[PDB]
C-alpha cells in the first residue's frame, strides 16, 4: 500500500511539473543494456572463455 | 594546497587551485571523449588570468596536446601553470579497456580456437551419442527404486491426510463443546473468559511453533514439513537408501540438461551455452 501510494504521488507530481518521464525511462534502460553488454564482454576479453549468449 | 583526482559515478573529477581566484575549482571530465587540449582550454576559460599552462610527464618531456585523458590518468604527471608546478598523482587504476599491443599468447589462443573450431563438430557429435547411452543406463538403474519410493510416499500421504482431517475434526468438536456449554448448561457470561483465553492460548501456541521449528505457522508449509518428517521416518522401517536415489535423480537431471544444452547448437547452429 505504501508503494502504491508513493507511485501515485510521484506520477501526479511529475505531471504537475511536466517531467519527461518517458525519456528518463528509455534513457535509464539503455545504460542498463550497455552495462550488461560490458559484463558479457568480460569472458572473451579477460579470461579467454566463450561468450555467454543472450539470457 | 595541492591537486586531487577522484572517480565518482564512473567520471573523473580534478580539483585545481587557481592563482587569480584563490578558490578550489573542480573539473568533471570524461577520460575517453576528451584530450589534454580541451582540458587546458577549460582551465584558460575558467581563469582567464593564467599566462600559460602545460602538462609534463614524470620525467620532464612535454606531453602532447592531443593525447586522450584516459591515456594520461594511468601514471603520475606534472601540471605547470605560469608560476606554479603541481605534481598530480592520479588514483591507482590498473586497466582501461584491455586494448594494447599484440602478444604471442594471443596467437597461441587463436590457434587453439582454430583447432577447437575444426574438431568440436566431431567431438559433440559422438558426445551426444554417449550421453544418450549414459542416460538410458542411469534410467534403468533407477526403475527398481522408483516403485519402492512410491510405496513409501503413499503411506506418507495417507498419514498427512489423517493429520489434516483430524485437525478439522478437533476444531469442530471444540466448537461443539463450547456451543453446548454456552447455551444449555451455563450462560455466556461464564464462557466468555474461557473462550478468550482459548484464543490467546492458540495465538501463543502458533508462536511457540515458530520458536521451535524456525518457520512461521502456515498451513501448506506445516503440511509439507509433516509430510517430509513422515517420509523420512518411514524410510527407516524399509532401509531405503535415499542417498543413492538422490544421486541418481541429480545425475539424470544433469545428463538431460547437458543433452538439451548440446543438441540445440546442432539443430539451429548457434553457440553452445
Amino acid at each position: 500500500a505504501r508503494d502504491r501510494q508513493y507511485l501515485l504521488f510521484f506520477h501526479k507530481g511529475a505531471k504537475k511539473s511536466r517531467f519527461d518521464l518517458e525519456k528518463y525511462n528509455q534513457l535509464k534502460d539503455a545504460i542498463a543494456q550497455a552495462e550488461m553488454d560490458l559484463k558479457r564482454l568480460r569472458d572473451p576479453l579477460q579470461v579467454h572463455l566463450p561468450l555467454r549468449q543472450i539470457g | 594546497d595541492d591537486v586531487t583526482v577522484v572517480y565518482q559515478n564512473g567520471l573523473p573529477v580534478i580539483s585545481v587551485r587557481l592563482p587569480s581566484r584563490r578558490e578550489r575549482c573542480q573539473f568533471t571530465l570524461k577520460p575517453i571523449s576528451d584530450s589534454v587540449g580541451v582540458f587546458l582550454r577549460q582551465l584558460q576559460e575558467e581563469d582567464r588570468g593564467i599566462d600559460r599552462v602545460a602538462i609534463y610527464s614524470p620525467d620532464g618531456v612535454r606531453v602532447a596536446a592531443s593525447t586522450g585523458i584516459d591515456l594520461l590518468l594511468l601514471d603520475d604527471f606534472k601540471l605547470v601553470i605560469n608560476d606554479l608546478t603541481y605534481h598530480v598523482r592520479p588514483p591507482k587504476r590498473d586497466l582501461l579497456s584491455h586494448e594494447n599491443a599484440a602478444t604471442l599468447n594471443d596467437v597461441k589462443t587463436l590457434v587453439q580456437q582454430l583447432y577447437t573450431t575444426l574438431c568440436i563438430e566431431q567431438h559433440q557429435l559422438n558426445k551426444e551419442r554417449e550421453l544418450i547411452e549414459r542416460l538410458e543406463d542411469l534410467k534403468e538403474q533407477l526403475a527398481p527404486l522408483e516403485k519402492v519410493r512410491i510405496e513409501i510416499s503413499r503411506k506418507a500421504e495417507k498419514r498427512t491426510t489423517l493429520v489434516l482431517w483430524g485437525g478439522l475434526a478437533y476444531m469442530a468438536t471444540q466448537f461443539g463443546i463450547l456451543a453446548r456449554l454456552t447455551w444449555w448448561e451455563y450462560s455466556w457470561d461464564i464462557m466468555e473468559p474461557v473462550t478468550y483465553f482459548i484464543t490467546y492460548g492458540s495465538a501463543m501456541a502458533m508462536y511457540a511453533y515458530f520458536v521451535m521449528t524456525r518457520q512461521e505457522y502456515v498451513y501448506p508449509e506445516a503440511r509439507d514439513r509433516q509430510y517430509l518428517l513422515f517420509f523420512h521416518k518411514g524410510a527407516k522401517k524399509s532401509r531405503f537408501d535415499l542417498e543413492k536415489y538422490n544421486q541418481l535423480k541429480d545425475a539424470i537431471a544433469q545428463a538431460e540438461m547437458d543433452l538439451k544444452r548440446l543438441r540445440d547448437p546442432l539443430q539451429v547452429h548457434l553457440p553452445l551455452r
Binding site: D3, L7, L8, Y24, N25, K28, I31, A32 | -
Partner: protein, 54 residues
C-alpha cells in the same frame, strides 16, 4: 517496489473508475436489505410464540 531492475520507474497504478462510489453503492443497499431480513425474521419468530425477549 518503486523501481525496476534498472533505474526506471514503475508505471502508474491502474485505478478503478469511480471506485469508492461503486463500493458504497453496493454496501449500503445490501445493508438495508439485511436489516429488513432481520426485522422480518424476528417478527415471524415472536409472532408464533417461539422466542420472546421479555
Amino acid at each position: 517496489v518503486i523501481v525496476t531492475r534498472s533505474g526506471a520507474i514503475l508505471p502508474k497504478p491502474v485505478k478503478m473508475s469511480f471506485g469508492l462510489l461503486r463500493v458504497f453503492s453496493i454496501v449500503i443497499p445490501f445493508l438495508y436489505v439485511g436489516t429488513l431480513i432481520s426485522k422480518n425474521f424476528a417478527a415471524l419468530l415472536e409472532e408464533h410464540d417461539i422466542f420472546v425477549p421479555e
